[PDB]
Amino acid sequence: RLESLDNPGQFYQADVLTQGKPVLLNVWATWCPTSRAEHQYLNQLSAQGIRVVGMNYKDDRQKAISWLKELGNPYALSLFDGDGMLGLDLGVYGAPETFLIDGNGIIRYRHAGDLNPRVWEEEIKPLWEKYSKEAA
Amino acid sequence: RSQFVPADQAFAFDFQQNQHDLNLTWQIKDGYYLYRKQIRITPEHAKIADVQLPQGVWHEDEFYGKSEIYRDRLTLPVTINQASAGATLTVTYQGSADAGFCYPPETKTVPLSEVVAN
Numbered sequence A: 001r002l003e004s005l006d007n008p009g010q011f012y013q014a015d016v017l018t019q020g021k022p023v024l025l026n027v028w029a030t031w032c033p034t035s036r037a038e039h040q041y042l043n044q045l046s047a048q049g050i051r052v053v054g055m056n057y058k059d060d061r062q063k064a065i066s067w068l069k070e071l072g073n074p075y076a077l078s079l080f081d082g083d084g085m086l087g088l089d090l091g092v093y094g095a096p097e098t099f100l101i102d103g104n105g106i107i108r109y110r111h112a113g114d115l116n117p118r119v120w121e122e123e124i125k126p127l128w129e130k131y132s133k134e135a136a
Numbered sequence B: 001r002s003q004f005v006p007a008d009q010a011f012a013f014d015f016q017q018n019q020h021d022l023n024l025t026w027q028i029k030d031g032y033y034l035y036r037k038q039i040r041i042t043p044e045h046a047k048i049a050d051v052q053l054p055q056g057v058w059h060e061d062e063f064y065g066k067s068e069i070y071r072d073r074l075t076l077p078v079t080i081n082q083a084s085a086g087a088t089l090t091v092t093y094q095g096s097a098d099a100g101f102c103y104p105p106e107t108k109t110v111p112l113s114e115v116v117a118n
């Protein structure tokens, strides 16, 4: 149910999402200027070793692929939710959004709006350390 | 903890018809706006006059450019020349929040009361 963006008809097993460990899920869209605004910080954070899954939201694959090409692809797993069904059961209602999901696939935090140093180093990191540790 | 409210609260849609005259309305929460270019109105089993969208204000997105938007409230009259029984009007629109949030497009289906052509 986790459709690949770079490869249309490829699906991943739920396990692949977290692989028994915390992960960040970022909802983004080429039609959302705020997604562009938070992307570089996202590249960096993913550069620091934080695992982040990408979920292209009700967007155009060609544009989406092109987008990550010119701006960078900070996702270890890049997903496509054109119909917006996946976002619907995660409770996604717009972009940008960033979710913290623990090693067990449970949503531990949802943030609507741009992801930045402030939000991470003040709302997510502590929860990230907790669940990263809680994944002994 | 979210500062961005549900789509239907930021853009509260309503309509009122009186025979050939239909008025589409959106109450737009302060700090949010609709994109004039994303409004689409499609009749089903009805014939309407070309809809003129009103003059809105302007918004700029660093890399995307300038777009004509609507704030506070949007009033859109539509003329129903004819509508058969069970006719509908598909109304699609899209908006965002100034603080930085974009809602996906939303579609509402308006049941039109029957109107015989004049």
Ligand SMILES: [Cl-]
Pocket (backbone or CB within 6 Å): A008
């Ligand atoms: Cl394809």
Ligand SMILES: [Cl-]
Pocket (backbone or CB within 6 Å): none
């Ligand atoms: Cl190319």
Ligand SMILES: [Cl-]
Pocket (backbone or CB within 6 Å): B045, B046, B084
């Ligand atoms: Cl008809």
